[PDB]
Amino acid sequence: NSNICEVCNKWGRLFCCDTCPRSFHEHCHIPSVEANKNPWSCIFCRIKTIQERCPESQSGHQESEVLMRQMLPEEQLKCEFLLLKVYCDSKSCFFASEPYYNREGSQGPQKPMWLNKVKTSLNEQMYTRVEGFVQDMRLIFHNHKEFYREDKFTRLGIQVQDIFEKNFRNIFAIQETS
Ligand SMILES: [Zn+2]
Ligand SMILES: [Zn+2]
Ligand SMILES: [Zn+2]
């Protein structure tokens, strides 16, 4: 097994996957690492199992169809994984905790959003469809773009949103287009 957390790349109190070599801090894994369960399989293993049980699940899909899916256990897991993939980028630190807005020439967003809030919402099963989760995620980056205007700090929103969007397309097998 790895000696660093797969998500934050730091050592510490790590839990090890029994079916692959990754390791996780307790609250870096999503959902949080489960109390008992030997063997334990991490979210990367559980996602790979889904694909292996249903190979045709990798054929291309339309985004509009994916967004209307109900949050049944397999969609729930996919959204948790996608969230996790965003936390794996170090620039997600800018979007993890609750922001505040006091900048000359800008007004704060009407509906603030941040990654820990989405994490909690997922955990408390507050999304009924994929669309709910995806809307909140995109809201994070949109609010950032709008608030930071022409400051070059806006680019952080672009970069982290690109990580989201690529992983979204991969995890939900969205039909490739030009
Ligand atoms: Zn970690
Ligand atoms: Zn694993
Ligand atoms: Zn099948």
Helix (H) or strand (E) holding 53: helix 43-53
Give the count of domains, the chain: 2
DSSP 70: B
C-alpha span between 73 and 78 (Å, rounded)? 9
The resolution in Å comes to: 2.0
Q: Are residues 46 and 130 in the same domain?
A: no
65 and 18 within one domain? no
Cα 70 to averaged position of ligand 2 atoms, centre (Å): 26
What's the CA-to-centroid distance between 61 and ligand 3, angstroms? 16
Going from the Cα of 48 to the center of ligand 3, the distance in angstroms, rounded, reads 14
d(CA 36, CA 39): 9
Backbone φ and ψ for 14, nearest 5 degrees, come out as -100, 140
User: Rounded to the nearest whole angstrom, what is the distance from the C-alpha of residue 48 to the centroid of ligand 2?
Assistant: 9
CB within 8 Å of 106: residues ≥ 6 apart: 147, 148, 149
Long-range contacts of the stretch 146-155 (C-beta < 8 A, 24+): 146/109, 147/101, 147/103, 147/106, 147/107, 147/108, 147/109, 148/103, 148/106, 149/105, 149/106
Residues 80 and 153 in one domain: yes
Contact (Cβ atoms closer than 8 angstroms) between residue 95 and residue 136 = no
- Experimental determination technique: X-ray
CA 27 to chain centroid, in Å, comes to 14
Q: Identify the CATH number of the domain in which residue 42 sits.
A: 3.30.40.10
Task: Provide the residue type at 148 as one letter.
Answer: Y
CATH code, domain with 98: 1.20.920.10
- Report CA(1)–ligand 2 centroid distance (Å): 10
Q: What is the C-alpha separation between 143 and 137, in angstroms, rounded?
A: 10
Question: Which residue type sits at 58?
Answer: Q
